[PDB]
Design a binder for this molecule. Structure first.
Ligand code: CLA
Ligand code: CLA
Ligand code: CLA
Ligand code: CLA
Ligand code: CLA
Ligand code: CLA
Ligand code: CLA
Ligand code: LMG
Ligand code: LHG
Ligand code: BCR
Ligand code: BCR
Lengths: 217, 170, 164, 74, 170, 146
């Protein structure tokens, strides 16, 4: 009606998306972040909300607010890293690899598709949860600091480079490297889906296919 | 333009109720008015006929014919053709009076007009309005009846047929 | 001009909505009739919706809950005396409404005469009025949908949110 | 429920704000001014508290006979 | 006339136009365009979409030989009537189809949300993989006109097709 | 928005313009009631009021009176209603005498002796007749069944 539409504020009509020529370009995907092909059909990057409020209630204190892209990038990176890790583990477990010095519980496991249940029953999953939680809390606080505007860390930057693969490297090269991580991560995320749905419906194997003629569920 | 003055306006406020703007100029209005009147007059007679027949009355030599639209389907076409011939003739006879409201056939060969029925201009307008209104009602009525006949067989919805009280006719 | 003055009814999802342009050449009086009809049809729909929902739910504590839960079956079961009172009563209110309409300053749809205290300058007033209209518009469509379901599909209960 | 009102950590509700916001077309300024009254008048507080306490006692009487709460009481 | 949208301007004839010329030039008897100028863009987009879908529907109807498709469930031999397929594979294939159609359609909302303010040409989703659209505007418009004309034909075509079957052995 | 304002814009009168007191509905209903309607003569005002009040009074007596279950219950109810109407009529007569006096002049002002007397007379006729109408109606009740 009369009120000015937020469409104007959440999209740049002058320019247009690259992956999607028809759609206009989201005003936030300006290319600063790596891997930006201007792809946000749902214009989620343009949503105005400090998602950092999840970690710390906004009412607690006045903060500048973490830009949406920062939060979104964080999640994308995290999801990707986790997915890549999971994929490797699934296959290795399928190959039979078990912990060095492990015992019957691990050895007996029939297939990765069945490991979760047996492990949760064993209780080891609980142990992992507590450990993972510690990591989450120890590393998450940084986001609040960034939103507060008191720190200038970038998304995914945990200053973690033991082997110095990227130490003293041309910025352009660091860029391609980080993109490589993102690309591999995105691939892994999609990969896990089949590694799950297919296995559930069909059976676990190197191809993890489902008996087309036979039932799946 | 403003046809509010024309007879048959819905009411003082709405004026001419033309939802789809069929009428644009006086020329069109005259066309539409003529049609409305013709359909109206025809319908008024139709309702009367349908009721008479459906209730059971039949002319001499028509005691075995069916009633309703069923008649048109079953009764011989040969005995229906007369209707067309008696109607087409009338179509030719009626003569529109120039410079007069649509549907005025005063110029017809046989005497036709307000005659003794109307005196003042107001009386004329009243009779005209009543003719139009009753026609409008019948137009809806004949449809309502036929539709319900097909739907349930009850053309009158609440009763099967009318019973007449004609003392002198007896 | 109605189009140049109307404020209530124009909302965010679609703004002014007249795809078929059924109001382009209409005068103020015709447009007033339309708005009054819109509101009345909508308000009656809202009420009908609530009635159907209650009956379908089974909360019809009248006549010893003898009448059926199916709203359409119940109507047939209701004695005519009940229906006559309904029509006549509504007719009475209609007469009074006509009196109010004739009075100078009538705003189409206002039977409480809220014009005496508030005008459309107040945004709160226009907004609340919009809510009535919007909910009424939705209700109109709903009552038409529900009847279809009961008469053709064969159900008179929610087939959308029932599956928790 | 005890974590609904603000104290010293930002999060929470301020009763004054809640009361003042609730005003309508038929009630003028609404519930404005009530907070000060109930935070500066013991008599006002006692009124509400005493009425509610008495009302509770009456409820206890009804609910404690229909639903006997103790062994060998009924 | 719209706002310059390619269309109409057709020698194509039509003797059943109740109101207006029998030609297809500027075919807008109802007159929705002038009454609702702001909806012209939307109407164009909807027209194109309906037509394009119809053009695919006809060929989909003309391939009831189960050709290029395996699977007993999909066997056109098993499901002789192409029409029966909708209910035949409703929960096995129709749902799948919906998934992709739905995802694709939702992604276009950004453009359609404010068509008037945005500059995208109605119906132009930048899809010319073979890069073969007459570069010349003169013919470019002609090409567009062909699409519209063929699409309009298709829309009507499908109706007859399907219905026809509803009244024949197929 | 305030739906309650001082009446007649007088902040000091003992009355308020609430939706109930001053709404189109209330105004319309009260304007057309026989008591305040414009044009009605004193007699007609009384008649309408009487016709209305007599019809609903026969009910209570007929269905809950001492002889309700008797075959002559409706007749008894009618008689009882007539008795009540007489009592009310006495009241009207007495009120007029005290409030208006003995000789009047204005005329056609419900608030004068002559007008009041005419009003009272109308009430009596209307009330008694209305009660009779109810007797005839309640004698045979329609089931409105087809
Ligand atoms: C990062 C993986 C990893 C690696 C490299 C090793 C490496 C080793 N393990 Mg080991 N282990 C692991 C995970 C791992 N473990 C886990 C997750 C468990 C839980 C069951 C165990 C339980 C385990 C036992 C019970 C024993 C080992 C032993 C050994 C030995 C060698 C140093 C043996 C040893 O003597 O350790 C020094 C031995 O007896 N491991
Ligand atoms: C993440 C979502 C997802 C889901 C739900 C599935 C689901 C499925 N995939 Mg699949 N797949 C995925 C991601 C996914 N896959 C990814 C990321 C790849 C990498 C290319 C594949 C590659 C793949 C192959 C190569 C095949 C499947 C097949 C299948 C089906 C067996 C099953 C329905 C099989 C199929 O076609 O069945 C429909 C099959 O042959 N998938
Ligand atoms: C629907 C068309 C139709 C048909 C098929 C008939 C058929 C018949 N009519 Mg008939 N009739 C009709 C319409 C029709 N009528 C109408 C509309 C009227 C009203 C004017 C009459 C008035 C009428 C009279 C007054 C008489 C007939 C008679 C007859 C019979 C002989 C016809 C006649 O006069 O001598 C050839 C014959 C069974 C005659 C009859 O049966 O003799 C007793 C007869 O006397 N009809
Ligand atoms: C098509 C049917 C028809 C026929 C055959 C006649 C035939 C006749 N009419 Mg006429 N008339 C008709 C329709 C018809 N009229 C209509 C529809 C009207 C109303 C407008 C009139 C109004 C009318 C009047 C006012 C008069 C006649 C008169 C006459 C007679 C001279 C003549 C017998 C005249 C007559 O002789 O009356 C006794 C006469 O004064 N008619
Ligand atoms: C003037 C006061 C008044 C009185 C005395 C009644 C009395 C009655 N109404 Mg009623 N009614 C009234 C006003 C009144 N209504 C109004 C103002 C409305 C709204 C317009 C209705 C709408 C209404 C409905 C819809 C129904 C009744 C029904 C009934 C009857 C109850 C069932 C029955 O017959 O048991 C003895 C009873 C005779 C019910 C009835 O007659 O059904 C049997 C019924 O269904 N009334
Ligand atoms: C505004 C939304 C809305 C509306 C109009 C309705 C309307 C209705 N629901 Mg429903 N429902 C809704 C939301 C809604 N529901 C939601 C969100 C849920 C999930 C909790 C349900 C769960 C639900 C159940 C489980 C049942 C209904 C039933 C009903 C019908 C009986 C009315 C009643 O008293 O309900 C109560 C009525 C048509 C009942 C029904 O269909 O009766 C036949 C019924 O059994 N509803
Ligand atoms: C989805 C259905 C659809 C829609 C939205 C349109 C939309 C349009 N058509 Mg169209 N058309 C259609 C189906 C449709 N067509 C079919 C099936 C045929 C073949 C019979 C045609 C034949 C046709 C011709 C010959 C012309 C148009 C023209 C137009 C444009 C202006 C006409 C107008 O007022 O809009 C119509 C608005 C609608 C909402 C469509 C009405 C749908 C229902 C009945 C209402 C407009 C973009 C004109 C044009 O392009 O001029 C520039 C023109 O000359 N159409
Ligand atoms: C009425 C005229 C004919 C009456 C008749 O023939 O009696 C014949 C009938 C006799 O009806 C009697 O009814 C009794 C009770 O049921 C008995 O049981 C018998 O049915 C019967 O013998 O009289 C009537 O009951 C009908 C008369 C009703 C009068 C209508 C009310 C008019 C206003 C009355 C108030 C008058 C006071 C001032 C008026 C202003
Ligand atoms: C009772 C219906 C009801 O709650 O209406 C409530 C009605 C409207 O209240 P408002 O929404 O305008 O005011 C809101 C504030 O009071 C906070 O709720 O207030 C009254 O005017 C009551 C009138 C006396 C009550 C008449 C007896
Ligand atoms: C609740 C309500 C309402 C109301 C209701 C009511 C209150 C009713 C009442 C009613 C009434 C209360 C009525 C009455 C009636 C009456 C009548 C109807 C009467 C009649 C009479 C007559 C007709 C006559 C008589 C006579 C005379 C006058 C004398 C001589 C003799 C004779 C008999 C002739 C309404 C619905 C609105 C709405 C809602 C609310
Ligand atoms: C509407 C209205 C109103 C209201 C009212 C009300 C709400 C209530 C009322 C109520 C009432 C007002 C009641 C009454 C009652 C009465 C009674 C209950 C009585 C009874 C009586 C009797 C029982 C008697 C008997 C007898 C006779 C008749 C004769 C002689 C002998 C003896 C004495 C035995 C007002 C006023 C505001 C205003 C106007 C309108």
């Amino acid at each position: 009606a009369m009120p000015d539409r937020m469409w104007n504020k959440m999209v740049d009509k002058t320019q247009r998306s690259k992956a999607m020529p028809f759609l206009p370009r989201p005003i936030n995907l300006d290319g600063s972040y790596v891997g930006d092909v201007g792809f946000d059909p749902f214009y989620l990057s343009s949503i105005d909300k400090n998602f950092a409020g999840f970690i710390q209630p906004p009412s607690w204190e006045e903060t500048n607010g973490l830009p949406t892209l920062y939060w979104m990038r964080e999640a994308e990176l995290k999801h990707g890293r986790i997915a890549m890790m999971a994929f490797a583990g699934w296959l290795a477990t399928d190959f039979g690899v078990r912990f060095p010095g492990a015992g019957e519980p691990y050895t007996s496991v029939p297939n990765a598709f069945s490991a979760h249940n047996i492990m949760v029953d064993s209780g080891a999953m609980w142990v992992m949860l507590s450990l993972i939680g510690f990591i989450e809390i120890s590393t998450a606080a940084v986001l609040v600091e960034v939103s507060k505007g008191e720190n200038d860390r970038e998304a995914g930057d945990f200053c973690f480079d033991p082997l110095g693969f990227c130490k003293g490297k041309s910025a352009d090269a660091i860029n391609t490297m980080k993109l490589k991580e993102l690309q591999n991560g995105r691939a892994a995320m999609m990969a896990f889906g089949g590694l799950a749905t297919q296995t559930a419906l069909g059976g676990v194997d190197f191809p993890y296919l489902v008996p087309y003629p036979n039932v799946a569920d | 333009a403003d046809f509010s003055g024309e007879i048959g306006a819905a009411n003082a406020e709405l004026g001419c109720w033309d939802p789809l703007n069929f009428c644009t100029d006086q020329a069109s209005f005259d066309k539409m008015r003529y049609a409305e009147l013709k359909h109206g007059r025809v319908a008024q007679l139709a309702a009367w006929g349908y009721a008479t027949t459906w209730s059971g009355a039949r002319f001499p030599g028509c005691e075995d014919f069916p009633a309703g639209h069923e008649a048109v389907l079953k009764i011989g076409t040969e005995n229906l053709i007369p209707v067309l011939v008696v109607a087409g003739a009338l179509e030719t006879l009626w003569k529109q009076k120039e410079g007069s409201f649509p549907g005025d056939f005063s110029a017809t060969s046989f005497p036709v007009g307000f005659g003794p029925f109307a005196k003042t201009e107001a009386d004329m307008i009243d009779l005209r309005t009543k003719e139009l209104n009753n026609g409008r009602a019948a137009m809806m009525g004949i449809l309502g009846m036929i539709v319900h006949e097909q739907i349930d067989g009850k053309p009158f919805i609440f009763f099967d047929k009318f019973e007449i009280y004609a003392p002198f006719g007896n | 001009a109605w189009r140049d003055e109307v404020v209530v009814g124009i909302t965010a999802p679609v703004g002014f909505f007249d795809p078929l342009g059924l109001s382009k050449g209409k005068d103020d009086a015709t447009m007033a009739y339309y708005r009054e009809a819109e509101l009345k049809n909508g308000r009656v729909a809202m009420a009908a919706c609530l009635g159907w929902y209650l009956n379908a739910g089974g909360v019809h504590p009248a006549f010893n809950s003898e009448l059926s839960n199916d709203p359409l079956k119940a109507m047939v079961e209701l004695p005519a005396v009940g229906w006559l009172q309904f029509v006549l009563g509504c007719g009475a209110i209609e007469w009074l409404g006509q009196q109010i309409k004739e009075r100078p300053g009538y705003v189409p749809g206002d039977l409480l005469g809220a014009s005496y205290w508030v005008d459309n300058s107040d945004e709160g007033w226009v907004m609340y009025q919009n809510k009535e209209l919007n909910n009424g518009r939705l209700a109109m469509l709903a009552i038409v949908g529900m009847v279809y379901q009961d008469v053709f599909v064969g159900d008179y209960g929610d087939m959308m949110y029932k599956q928790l | 429920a005890g974590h609904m009102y603000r104290t010293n950590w930002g999060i929470g509700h301020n009763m004054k704000e809640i009361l003042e916001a609730h005003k309508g077309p038929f009630t003028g300024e609404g519930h404005k001014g009530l907070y000060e009254i109930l935070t500066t008048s013991w008599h006002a507080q006692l009124a509400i508290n005493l009425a509610m306490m008495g009302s509770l006692s009456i409820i206890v009487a009804h609910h404690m006979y229909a639903m006997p709460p103790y062994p060998y009481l009924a | 006339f719209a706002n310059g949208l390619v269309g109409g301007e057709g020698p194509e004839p039509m003797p059943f136009n109740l109101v207006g010329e029998k030609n297809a030039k500027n075919f807008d008897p109802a007159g929705f365009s002038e009454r609702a100028p702001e909806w012209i863009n939307w109407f164009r987009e909807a027209e194109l979409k309906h037509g394009r879908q119809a053009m695919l529907a006809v060929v989909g109807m003309v391939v009831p030989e189960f050709v290029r498709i395996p699977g007993e469930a999909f066997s056109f031999e098993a499901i002789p009537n192409v029409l029966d397929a909708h209910d035949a594979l409703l929960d096995t294939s129709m749902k799948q189809i919906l998934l992709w159609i739905s995802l694709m359609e939702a992604m276009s909302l950004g453009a359609l949300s404010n068509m008037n303010e945005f500059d995208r040409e109605p119906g132009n989703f930048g899809f010319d993989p073979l890069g073969m659209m007459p570069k010349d505007a003169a013919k470019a418009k002609e090409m567009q006109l062909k699409e519209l004309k063929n699409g309009r034909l298709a829309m009507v075509a499908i109706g007859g097709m399907v219905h026809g079957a509803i009244t024949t052995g197929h | 928005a305030n739906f309650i304002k001082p009446y007649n814009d007088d902040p000091f009168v003992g009355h308020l313009a609430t939706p109930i007191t001053s709404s189109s509905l209330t105004r319309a209903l009260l304007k057309n009631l026989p008591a305040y309607r414009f044009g009605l003569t004193p007699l007609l005002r009384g008649l309408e009021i009487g016709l209305a009040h007599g019809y609903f009074l026969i009910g209570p007596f007929a269905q809950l009176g001492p002889l309700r279950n008797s075959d002559i219950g409706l007749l008894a109810g009618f008689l009882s209603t007539i008795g009540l109407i007489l009592i009310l009529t006495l009241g009207l007569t007495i009120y007029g005498a005290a409030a208006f006096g003995q000789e009047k002049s204005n005329g056609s002002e419900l608030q004068t002796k002559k007008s009041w007397d005419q009003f009272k007379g109308g009430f009596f006729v209307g009330a008694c007749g209305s009660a009779g109408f109810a007797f005839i109606c309640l004698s045979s009740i329609p089931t409105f069944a087809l």
